[PDB]
Target: glycogen phosphorylase B
Amino acid sequence: RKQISVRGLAGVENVTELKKNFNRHLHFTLVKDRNVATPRDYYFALAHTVRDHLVGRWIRTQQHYYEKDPKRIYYLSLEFYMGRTLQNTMVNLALENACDEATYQLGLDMEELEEIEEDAGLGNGGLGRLAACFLDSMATLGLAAYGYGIRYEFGIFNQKICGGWQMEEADDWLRYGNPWEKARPEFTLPVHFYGRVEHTSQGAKWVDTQVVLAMPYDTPVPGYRNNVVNTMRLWSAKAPNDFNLKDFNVGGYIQAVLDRNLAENISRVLYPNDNFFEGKELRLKQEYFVVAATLQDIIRRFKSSKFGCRDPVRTNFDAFPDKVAIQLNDTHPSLAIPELMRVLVDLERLDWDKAWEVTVKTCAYTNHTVIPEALERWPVHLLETLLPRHLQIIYEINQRFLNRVAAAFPGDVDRLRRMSLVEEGAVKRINMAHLCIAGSHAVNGVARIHSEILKKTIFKDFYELEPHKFQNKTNGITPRRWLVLCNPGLAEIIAERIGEEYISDLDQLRKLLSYVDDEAFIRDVAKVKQENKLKFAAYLEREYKVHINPNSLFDVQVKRIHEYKRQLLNCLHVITLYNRIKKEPNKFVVPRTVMIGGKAAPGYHMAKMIIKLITAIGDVVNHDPVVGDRLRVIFLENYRVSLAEKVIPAADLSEQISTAGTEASGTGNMKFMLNGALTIGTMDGANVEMAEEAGEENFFIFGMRVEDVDRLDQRGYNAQEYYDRIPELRQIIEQLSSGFFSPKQPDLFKDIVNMLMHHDRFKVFADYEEYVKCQERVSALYKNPREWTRMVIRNIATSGKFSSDRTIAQYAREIWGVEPSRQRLPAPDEKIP
Amino acid sequence: RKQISVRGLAGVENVTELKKNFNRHLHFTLVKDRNVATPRDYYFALAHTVRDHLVGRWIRTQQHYYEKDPKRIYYLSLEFYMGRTLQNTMVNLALENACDEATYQLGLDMEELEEIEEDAGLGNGGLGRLAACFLDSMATLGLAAYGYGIRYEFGIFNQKICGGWQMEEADDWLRYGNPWEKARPEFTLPVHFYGRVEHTSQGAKWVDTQVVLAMPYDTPVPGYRNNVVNTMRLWSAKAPNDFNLKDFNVGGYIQAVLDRNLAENISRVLYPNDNFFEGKELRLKQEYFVVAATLQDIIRRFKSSKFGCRDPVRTNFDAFPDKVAIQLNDTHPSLAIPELMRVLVDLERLDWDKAWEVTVKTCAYTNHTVIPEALERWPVHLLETLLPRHLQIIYEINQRFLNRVAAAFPGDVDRLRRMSLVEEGAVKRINMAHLCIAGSHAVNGVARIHSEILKKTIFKDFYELEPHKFQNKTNGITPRRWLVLCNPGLAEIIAERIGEEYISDLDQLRKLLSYVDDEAFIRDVAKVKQENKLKFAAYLEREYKVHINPNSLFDVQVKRIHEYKRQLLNCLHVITLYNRIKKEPNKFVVPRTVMIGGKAAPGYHMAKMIIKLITAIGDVVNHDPVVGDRLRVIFLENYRVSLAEKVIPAADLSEQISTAGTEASGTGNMKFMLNGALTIGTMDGANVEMAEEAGEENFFIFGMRVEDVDRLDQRGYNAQEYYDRIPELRQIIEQLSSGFFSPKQPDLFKDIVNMLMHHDRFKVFADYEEYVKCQERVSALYKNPREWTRMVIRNIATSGKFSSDRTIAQYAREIWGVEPSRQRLPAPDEKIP
Ligand SMILES: O=P(O)(O)O[C@H]1O[C@H](CO)[C@@H](O)[C@H](O)[C@H]1O
Ligand SMILES: O=P(O)(O)O[C@H]1O[C@H](CO)[C@@H](O)[C@H](O)[C@H]1O
Ligand SMILES: O=P(O)(O)O[C@H]1O[C@H](CO)[C@@H](O)[C@H](O)[C@H]1O
Ligand SMILES: O=P(O)(O)O[C@H]1O[C@H](CO)[C@@H](O)[C@H](O)[C@H]1O
Ligand SMILES: *Cc1c(COP(=O)(O)O)cnc(C)c1O
Ligand SMILES: *Cc1c(COP(=O)(O)O)cnc(C)c1O
Model:
């Protein structure tokens, strides 16, 4: 904690320049004086000074792509889980140490001020943090890339526990302002809703629509020390001045204005589910909105290219795929496909068949899950009302698609019903995943098991029609935030031995294999990890008044609360540990702090019941005198990016416990591998490529492989068989059944026990025995320090592959068709032209 | 138009400093480049550079009152009609010419950029523009004064004409931002609504209330060249994070967030009526809100005074009147009275009788009208629901008030029902005007007739109980905006002869009497007025494509459209003029451009019918070939402060035509006297003190005096008598009745004719004959140039009295108890302490 790592150069002219501009923004921007200013005021004076060092290059990077006019990548996501922006901008700009100096000289602690920034919580979990780490890597690799999303007013709710229950409240992240965005009202666009389609003369024209306006807000995304600053464009909904008021017949003037926030409700709140599908109208309107305005912004800056110079016997949209690439993050932007067809056929007047070749060559889709409840099936009755031309375009696309399928698989009548984008049943629906494979030229999974499972199970039919479309790109994590930024010490001690070229070339970590038997490296790695555990132990006791023993194994499961991720199996393990020492008190066991955190989506009653169980286990366990400090269970309240940055560097053991076949990739598992945690995990998602990368000896794999899960499903999963055969498991069911964990509330956990017993979709009891055996094996190693740290050096040295720079260099190469670069653009500036 | 008047010094180091900081805000603040920036971007770079020159003094003026701790004036208004802020700040700071230079040097036209600023339209008419000119004069006179209002999202609607009909639309003034406010989320306060009163032990406690938060936004108000910059604090409503979400039982999570803009609706839109009363709940909530949070801000900075040093055997609220003065602008903040009682008795726990002496000594009320439909009578049933403790405090105040009245006027039973703050009828109501006289120590009218009429008619009972409470302070206008700023040339030519000391000492204009027979002054005055008429003639033809003859009398009536202000009598005059030349075509008449402008409140059907008449008269008159350029009638669309600043300097004749006894003061009449217009007017409001000031020979007074209006009311106004006796008036009624003005729509004006004939509250026909005679007299003078300009020099030299600096020096002296000052505070700065 003496600090001073290579957070860059703290050099004289710059620290001078900085203190000076901090003191100018406090006075001139904040209109605050040295005697009235609080730590929030000073956080902003610094946020504003650091934003200043970035505008030069943002301007330079934007006029630069204009000039050299590359192929542009538009990554469409409904979520961007950015976390906080000050420190990361200082890391990518080389300003961390200069600003630490400058601030200590003004008498302030930088770390005090960085805690003042609220998180940009515009995401739910993995899919949104993926988008965020892709942004960082696209600018670090010099790509002309733009993230396009919604600027939600309220991000993911802030989780609160009251009596061990989750209490949700609004995330008013913008209460205090945002020093990082630049509102752009100049560039507002209209999005159309509802309406009629008239078929008049040569064309459909969508007529009688309500107009909402999409007002943009751009945030800079700086690549790591390469002077590229790209743009995240987030749309906000604005009601028009005329119809939100103007049309003549009494209703009410004041009312007509009060009803504007109704159009403005489209960007008010993030829909809060990880892996579930919400069939609500407001969600489809968010999805059309972001697609609508983004495609306008894409066509505009394509027409301004060398067509708005030579429209080459009219603007030839033929080069549209060679100038545009749009990545659909999940099916949430899938309306991009009938909308690019709507603008091209209806407005730009190309042939259906020309527009279709163009749409397919520019669109590509990333699939993020296999579980059927997460998939989007939008009821035809609401695409008909709200978007009646896009339904016609989708019925037409369906038609032409299945005409291909019939010609390829002639006579095969069940094929055709299975492939259809239009699903019959009572509610006739539209399968959006089907629309994206049909209309994209590449479809990909986020981990090699996941990509094989799509080819083999879920989109088998589609693989047999167009095998070449299906690809894989295993996920990644950005080493800048997820190593340099959250773990300045680990990055430091690596930097001493192998240099710094690895923050943008993480494969170089393999060079650390050579230090596995070097006692200097083995004590420094063990030292960083104790420093981080002591810092988190102290955060806990100050910010949250809990007190934990820093000398125990820090056992942590942090991710959204869902049944397939199996916090229940980990709770079953904690109660085994509790009971093995209550029957044999004076038996020594390796001590551990079990920390579980994550948010439940608000009406998912099972996940909300899981958080009540965990707090109930901690109520018992943490106050048993026979237990002592040997075991404490801790629920980790309001988990999100800033909390992940402090708890992942302090973990010894990482829980990655999903039923094989259910977690498509996972990325918390990589964040933890980077930071000196060992993984206990099933062979699911990217855990399989991580154990292959580090070797299975250096990993703690247990449980059913996918084969084993299918064998059991053919057979029939019967959870009673496990109740019968394992007395310890028997014992826990009756502790839950008979009120041990809910004394004055005894029947309380009756539906988690019932679900386990009769309705376990994720067959928790089946991996239990082999999981408590694998847990005996990690405590064996922990009590042998030097040998835990060598297995740790083996995981950190093998993290390479899992950087998002690799994942994006593969998207670029094999899907977008751009070559990454790392040549620092010659910014900043001084100048004006 | 060569320009260069004394708009200050354009001096070398400063113009250097300016261009430099303009170019820094364009790059760093606007994140715009010289090749991408538009006139809006450049307006903001300049707005931001000019705001910078003001923050030094704002900080200095605020720490300065802290230190010397004066008596503070809080002017509570629900309206502040500010207009645009760039130019006025440059005028009060001496930056006009330095910035004109700086901008021409960057190659831009300042006047092009000033048209980019939208108006702060937070007001309806006179009452709100009064508040605005009081703000300017309070800072020019060094008063520690704070305007407190609501920060409305949508100001007064923007008026649009479609087929001669007014079309209202939302004033999205903030669409682009506001370079002038400084949001202060740090200082957010809660306001309570609904609830119960529990009577428990020693006290009522208001319990079970919904909380809304009042988030402040401060705008600087710079005095004219004296380095004082005071604060306008405008509250915005914010929903809380907990109950706008948190309390447990299903309803909906997304819904609970979408329902926040419901609490946030309290500051969304200005209520749009000049002189009418809206009994709607949302209005009362705006009124409680602004009172609630302001009183919190007042008590806070009173406790921080030398009580938060010595609470002198507890905080003695005894000095509260000697440290606090709160001016109630109309009854719209009257809840300040039971709220100061609520905090003092309920929370601070003083005796009713001690708190009452304190409340009365700090509160004072300005009455703005006599017409009964504008008065506030809030139904008890909604003060009971929404504000149940304040109703108890008001029933108690009523009680104690009438106990005084009975003791003073013993036996006088009708007195007591007339005085009551609580009015019986079906709907039992609360007379808010009655509450303010009861609870204030000074009550005042806004013109000497108006103040005599309150003593004699409306609050006679109250004058007989407390004669000493009733005062007068005739209104005013700020010479800075309403002379220097809109008429730089007139100010210039005056400045040459008598110097500049008059912009803060307007009485010095009398020294101009000496120049009435000086031919240099007589041609320069006549020259300015033709330059202004040519500039407005050109604005008209560019911005609004109309074309008018600049050599005709510019006859203008601009104010809100209401029956008592009598745009109908002026329309009757225009049609007489039209017809006197259609019967005698080749008769020479003095040519005039009749311009009428103003907004109708949206559901006032009569005023909306008056705007359709005027446009209908222009449809006829403006296309009659026999008329030629001799007569054009023009309706002046979307009237407000920026349009008043361009049309008032270009007027020759000012219409001030209300029924005597109805316009309490008027302030457009003063703006026009300052700017070389002659007044045709009844002896109403401040027209009486203006003609007394200039002398009746130099004024065009006509019509019934108040006596004459009463004599007619006892008699009975019969409009048929005037139809019978005046053939020209006869003739116009049948032109309206028989479709001359609405050919294909012939029955169209049937209820204006019917109202004139049977229901004229403002007896238009009674002043008609004497008004068309007074109109022959102004055209006689107009065709004698040298003699119009001498009557003009007589009005401009007599404007003195009507400056708001005099009005505020009288409020200060005779009501607040502070002595004005004009000593320039030693700001700006450089420094930090
Ligand atoms: O959406 P665009 O035009 O590509 O990006 C927009 O902001 C950029 C950064 O200020 C400018 O350089 C562009 O000229 C501007 O129009
Ligand atoms: O939103 P979640 O569930 O955290 O994340 C979802 O997309 C992520 C990024 O592709 C994957 O790692 C997860 O396996 C998937 O379930
Ligand atoms: O409401 P207050 O405290 O009187 O005014 C507030 O803004 C002023 C100008 O920045 C400061 O000087 C005060 O210290 C601050 O607390
Ligand atoms: O809102 P309005 O009607 O323009 O203005 C109202 O208050 C003004 C300021 O005291 C007075 O001059 C007007 O006579 C009065 O009717
Ligand atoms: C990386 C990240 C995720 C993803 O975690 P998984 O364990 O892959 O499901 C979710 N939440 C946060 C805050 C993250 O940083
Ligand atoms: C001064 C002013 C008013 C007041 O006009 P009156 O003629 O007194 O009713 C109303 N509107 C605007 C825009 C003003 O400037």
Q: What stands out?
A: The domain at 477-803 of chain B is CATH 3.40.50.2000 (Rossmann fold). Chain B has two domains: 1-476+804-827, 477-803. The two ends of chain B are 46 Å apart (CA to CA). The first helix of chain B runs from residue 13 to 29.
